[PDB]
Amino acid sequence: SAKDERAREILRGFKLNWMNLRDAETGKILWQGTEDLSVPGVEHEARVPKKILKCKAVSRELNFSSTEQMEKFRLEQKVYFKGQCLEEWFFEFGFVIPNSTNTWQSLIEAAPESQMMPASVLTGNVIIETKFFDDDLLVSTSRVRLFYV
Numbered sequence: 001s002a003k004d005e006r007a008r009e010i011l012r013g014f015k016l017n018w019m020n021l022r023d024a025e026t027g028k029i030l031w032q033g034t035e036d037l038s039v040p041g042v043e044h045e046a047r048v049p050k051k052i053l054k055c056k057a058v059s060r061e062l063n064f065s066s067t068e069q070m071e072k073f074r075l076e077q078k079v080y081f082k083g084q085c086l087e088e089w090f091f092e093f094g095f096v097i098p099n100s101t102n103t104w105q106s107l108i109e110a111a112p113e114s115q116m117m118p119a120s121v122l123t124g125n126v127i128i129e130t131k132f133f134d135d136d137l138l139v140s141t142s143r144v145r146l147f148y149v
């Protein structure tokens, strides 16, 4: 179908160039990288600081390029611990200009009544599953395993 082909076209033209995470309260950099974690079909790894688990909120800046136009570019993310989905996040970018490069700032908060497990338990056992959409159209599904260091 036209939609399966369009999805592959967007994937082909897409690149994550860089990304960082900051403590939202203080603005301090917690993590930054230039690995394209959007690449599907391989398990990526990232090492984040234990500290992050103590942040009430984390600000993420994500930089990407797209050759293809997108009407409603958005992400769905799932936080799995040992195969169990603990939390589900939804972020919207909206409209993407063909052959543009864009910086996308999002704010991450865990539910207020949730208490974080220690880093030592979590480390190596957290997978972040990210789905890239243009509206209803699934472009890419990627996985990153997290180590808390």
Ligand SMILES: CNc1cc(CN(CC2CCNCC2)S(=O)(=O)c2ccc(S(=O)(=O)N(Cc3ccc(Cl)cc3)C3CCCC3)cc2)ccc1C(=O)O
Pocket (backbone or CB within 6 Å): 016, 021, 031, 037, 038, 046, 047, 048, 052, 053, 054, 055, 056, 057, 058, 060, 077, 079, 086, 087, 108, 109, 110, 111, 114, 115, 116, 117, 118, 122, 126, 128, 130, 142, 144, 146
């Ligand atoms: C809700 N439960 C938890 C959630 C988390 C997820 N954390 C969010 C924090 C928890 C503390 N309060 C503030 C929010 S996290 O610190 O481990 C975290 C931060 C950021 C991300 S991320 O989605 O922004 N991102 C993964 C990512 C981002 C973009 C794309 Cl395209 C692909 C993958 C980063 C890339 C390098 C490391 C993580 C994922 C998990 C951790 C532990 C628990 C727990 O119950 O023990």
